[PDB]
Design a protein around this ligand. Sequence first.
Ligand SMILES: [K+]
Ligand SMILES: [K+]
Length: 161
Amino acid sequence: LVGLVKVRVVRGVNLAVRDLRSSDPYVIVRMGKQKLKTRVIKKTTNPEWNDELTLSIEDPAVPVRLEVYDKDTFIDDAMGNAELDIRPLVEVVKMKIEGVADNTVVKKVVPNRQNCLAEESTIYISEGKVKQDVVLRLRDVECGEIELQLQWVDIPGSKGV
Ligand SMILES: [K+]
Ligand SMILES: [K+]
């Protein structure tokens, strides 16, 4: 492993309705074959999950994938998906910035037609730590955004594989 990334799934905003008036949403978060899930919150389209899911990083070029679903007795309807590139986070990690003020913004990632960003994403230092604030717009669904906060975790050493 090269490190860990704490993915705090903060909230879903205006998610799709999949059970007539509301939904029972959860997120599956993947990095390749690695997969984790948030809790389910019942009968909301604005879930305040605030669930932190920690991914082991082996290859930072593999996207982090997020899939939202409705929990249901018969079929768990999809409620959109998105993905995120953690290479910008890793780029800032490699700058080895230390000793600065909290919330020192050092890199910004802009939305474009290929990525899933809803707005400019900021990568910042709150020491020792490298963090990223992300809002993702969901694909393959009529509405919905997911708000995330990422945090890099270094794996202490020990060096030379
Ligand atoms: K349904
Ligand atoms: K449901």
